[PDB]
Amino acid sequence: LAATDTLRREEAARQALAGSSEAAMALAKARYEGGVDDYLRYLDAQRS
C-alpha cells in the first residue's frame, strides 16, 4: 500500500516533469525553426 500510494504520487510528479520537458520541446523547436537557435540546441532539448 505504501509503495502504491507513493508511486502514484511519484508518477504524477514524473508525468509533470515529462510535460515540462515537452514544453521545452515546443519552445526550442519554435526557436530553431525561427532561426534563432541552431540544430544543436534543438537536439539537446530532444535528448533531455
Binding site: 519552445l27 519554435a30 526557436r31 525561427g34 534563432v36
Partner: protein, 50 residues
C-alpha cells in the same frame, strides 16, 4: 570631395548593414516573444537595437 563622398557612403553602408541585421533580429524575435520563447527583456533590447 569625391573621396570624402566615398568615405561618407562607406559609413552609410556600414550603418545600413547594421540596420539590416537589427531588422532581421527583430523579425525573428517578434513571433518568439509572443509565445515567450525569448524574454520580453531580450525583445525590448532587440527593438532598442533596431
Amino acid at each position: 570631395f569625391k573621396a570624402a563622398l566615398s568615405r561618407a557612403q562607406g559609413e552609410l553602408a556600414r550603418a545600413e548593414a547594421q540596420l539590416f541585421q537589427a531588422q532581421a533580429m527583430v523579425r525573428r524575435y517578434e513571433p518568439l516573444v509572443k509565445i515567450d520563447a525569448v524574454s520580453q527583456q531580450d525583445f525590448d533590447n532587440a527593438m532598442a537595437a533596431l
